[PDB]
Design a protein around this motif. Structure first.
Motif, PDB file in Angstrom:
ATOM      1  N   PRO A 295     -17.147  88.508  55.574  1.00 45.38           N
ATOM      2  CA  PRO A 295     -16.102  88.289  54.590  1.00 45.38           C
ATOM      3  C   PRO A 295     -16.603  87.566  53.340  1.00 45.38           C
ATOM      4  CG  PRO A 295     -15.312  87.865  56.856  1.00 45.38           C
ATOM      5  CD  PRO A 295     -16.795  87.983  56.915  1.00 45.38           C
ATOM      6  N   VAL A 296     -16.230  88.042  52.170  1.00 45.21           N
ATOM      7  CA  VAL A 296     -16.512  87.326  50.913  1.00 45.21           C
ATOM      8  C   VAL A 296     -16.030  85.870  50.930  1.00 45.21           C
ATOM      9  CG1 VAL A 296     -15.912  87.204  48.485  1.00 45.21           C
ATOM     10  CG2 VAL A 296     -16.575  89.400  49.506  1.00 45.21           C
ATOM     11  N   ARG A 297     -14.868  85.607  51.512  1.00 41.64           N
ATOM     12  CA  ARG A 297     -14.344  84.208  51.554  1.00 41.64           C
ATOM     13  C   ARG A 297     -15.117  83.229  52.442  1.00 41.64           C
ATOM     14  NH1 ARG A 297      -9.612  82.749  55.615  1.00 41.64           N
ATOM     15  NH2 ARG A 297      -9.982  84.330  57.223  1.00 41.64           N
ATOM     16  N   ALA A 298     -15.940  83.735  53.368  1.00 43.07           N
ATOM     17  CA  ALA A 298     -16.879  82.926  54.171  1.00 43.07           C
ATOM     18  C   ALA A 298     -18.260  82.620  53.511  1.00 43.07           C
ATOM     19  CB  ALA A 298     -17.132  83.668  55.579  1.00 43.07           C
ATOM     20  N   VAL A 299     -18.544  83.187  52.339  1.00 43.00           N
ATOM     21  CA  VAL A 299     -19.846  83.046  51.702  1.00 43.00           C
ATOM     22  C   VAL A 299     -20.073  81.615  51.307  1.00 43.00           C
ATOM     23  CG1 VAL A 299     -21.149  83.576  49.571  1.00 43.00           C
ATOM     24  CG2 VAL A 299     -20.103  85.455  50.927  1.00 43.00           C
ATOM     25  N   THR A 300     -21.240  81.069  51.650  1.00 42.19           N
ATOM     26  CA  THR A 300     -21.600  79.701  51.256  1.00 42.19           C
ATOM     27  C   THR A 300     -22.424  79.715  49.984  1.00 42.19           C
ATOM     28  OG1 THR A 300     -23.747  79.566  52.326  1.00 42.19           O
ATOM     29  CG2 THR A 300     -21.823  79.213  53.723  1.00 42.19           C
ATOM     30  N   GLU A 301     -22.140  78.797  49.064  1.00 44.62           N
ATOM     31  CA  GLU A 301     -22.862  78.787  47.800  1.00 44.62           C
ATOM     32  C   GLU A 301     -24.351  78.699  48.024  1.00 44.62           C
ATOM     33  OE1 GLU A 301     -23.020  75.622  44.734  1.00 44.62           O
ATOM     34  OE2 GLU A 301     -21.897  77.052  43.452  1.00 44.62           O
ATOM     35  N   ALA A 302     -24.778  77.945  49.031  1.00 49.76           N
ATOM     36  CA  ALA A 302     -26.203  77.779  49.309  1.00 49.76           C
ATOM     37  C   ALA A 302     -26.898  79.088  49.676  1.00 49.76           C
ATOM     38  CB  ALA A 302     -26.417  76.736  50.414  1.00 49.76           C
ATOM     39  N   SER A 303     -26.179  80.047  50.252  1.00 53.33           N
ATOM     40  CA  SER A 303     -26.744  81.372  50.510  1.00 53.33           C
ATOM     41  C   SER A 303     -26.812  82.264  49.254  1.00 53.33           C
ATOM     42  CB  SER A 303     -25.948  82.094  51.620  1.00 53.33           C
ATOM     43  OG  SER A 303     -24.672  82.530  51.171  1.00 53.33           O
ATOM     44  N   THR A 304     -26.217  81.842  48.138  1.00 57.27           N
ATOM     45  CA  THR A 304     -26.258  82.644  46.921  1.00 57.27           C
ATOM     46  C   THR A 304     -27.341  82.136  45.948  1.00 57.27           C
ATOM     47  OG1 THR A 304     -24.615  81.328  45.724  1.00 57.27           O
ATOM     48  CG2 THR A 304     -23.788  83.131  47.109  1.00 57.27           C
ATOM     49  N   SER A 305     -27.765  83.002  45.026  1.00 60.84           N
ATOM     50  CA  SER A 305     -28.715  82.628  43.986  1.00 60.84           C
ATOM     51  C   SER A 305     -28.262  83.121  42.637  1.00 60.84           C
ATOM     52  CB  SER A 305     -30.071  83.243  44.283  1.00 60.84           C
ATOM     53  OG  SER A 305     -30.997  82.892  43.279  1.00 60.84           O
ATOM     54  N   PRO A 306     -28.454  82.301  41.579  1.00 62.93           N
ATOM     55  CA  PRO A 306     -28.112  82.713  40.217  1.00 62.93           C
ATOM     56  C   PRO A 306     -29.128  83.696  39.647  1.00 62.93           C
ATOM     57  CG  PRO A 306     -29.168  80.619  40.125  1.00 62.93           C
ATOM     58  CD  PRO A 306     -29.002  80.936  41.592  1.00 62.93           C
ATOM     59  N   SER A 307     -30.306  83.761  40.247  1.00 61.41           N
ATOM     60  CA  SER A 307     -31.350  84.672  39.774  1.00 61.41           C
ATOM     61  C   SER A 307     -31.384  86.016  40.507  1.00 61.41           C
ATOM     62  CB  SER A 307     -32.710  83.978  39.856  1.00 61.41           C
ATOM     63  OG  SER A 307     -32.986  83.555  41.178  1.00 61.41           O
ATOM     64  N   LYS A 308     -30.490  86.216  41.478  1.00 58.83           N
ATOM     65  CA  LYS A 308     -30.396  87.508  42.186  1.00 58.83           C
ATOM     66  C   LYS A 308     -29.245  88.357  41.671  1.00 58.83           C
ATOM     67  CE  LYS A 308     -32.102  85.889  46.700  1.00 58.83           C
ATOM     68  NZ  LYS A 308     -31.820  86.055  48.158  1.00 58.83           N
ATOM     69  N   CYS A 309     -29.158  88.510  40.354  1.00 58.85           N
ATOM     70  CA  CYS A 309     -28.011  89.165  39.734  1.00 58.85           C
ATOM     71  C   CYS A 309     -28.414  90.198  38.695  1.00 58.85           C
ATOM     72  CB  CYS A 309     -27.086  88.113  39.109  1.00 58.85           C
ATOM     73  SG  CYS A 309     -26.582  86.781  40.316  1.00 58.85           S
TER      74      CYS A 309
END
Length: 174
Positions: free
Chosen positions: A160-174
């Motif tokens: 689910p998108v609502r379970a995504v943790t910010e720490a698992s995301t990157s600003p450079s993977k876009c």
């Protein structure tokens, strides 16, 4: 001689501008401003021009599912303050720009499922937070509308998108 406002490719009811299923590549000009319902679903619209829905201030229902949208201009829904139902399912959306849904304060049903939401990219954080703060209006269709906030899911992994943790995301993977 005088003719009706209706886009000529579409069909019009007293309340509905029906432009579904007509292989449209773009949103037609001349959608009347006095209609409450617009169906643009099941077409091949690849983009929304900035300002396209700005005059459609009385719109309550906007179905745009099964098109080829890859992005949403940030202010595209800004004037649709009356809108109660918005279907964006089955597009190619990867994220929603920050603040896109700010002015949609009447929404009771939003459908976001079957889009490749990119949950590795930090841009997904707006949608994550927005879903998490509006779970009672996130719907999927299964015969009838069903409230399912887990129905917006990350491309590939199906988490689910609502379970995504910010720490698992990157600003450079876009």
């Amino acid at each position: 001689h005088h003719s009706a406002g209706c886009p000529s490719q579409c069909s019009c009811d007293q309340t509905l501008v029906n432009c579904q299923n007509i292989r449209l590549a773009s949103v037609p000009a001349g959608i009347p401003t006095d209609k409450q319902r617009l169906w643009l679903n099941n077409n091949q619209i690849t983009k929304l021009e900035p300002g396209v829905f700005d005059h459609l201030v009385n719109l309550q229902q906007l179905y745009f599912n099964s098109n080829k949208l890859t992005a949403i201009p940030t202010g595209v829904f800004d004037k649709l303050t009356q809108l109660t139902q918005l279907d964006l399912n089955d597009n190619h959306l990867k994220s929603i720009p920050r603040g896109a849904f700010d002015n949609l304060k009447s929404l009771t049903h939003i459908y976001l499922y079957n889009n490749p939401w990119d949950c590795e990219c930090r841009d997904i954080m707006y949608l994550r937070n927005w879903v998490a703060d509006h779970t009672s209006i996130v719907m999927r269709w299964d015969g009838k509308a069903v409230n399912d906030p887990d129905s917006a899911k990350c491309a590939g992994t199906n988490t689910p998108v609502r379970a995504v943790t910010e720490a698992s995301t990157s600003p450079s993977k876009c």
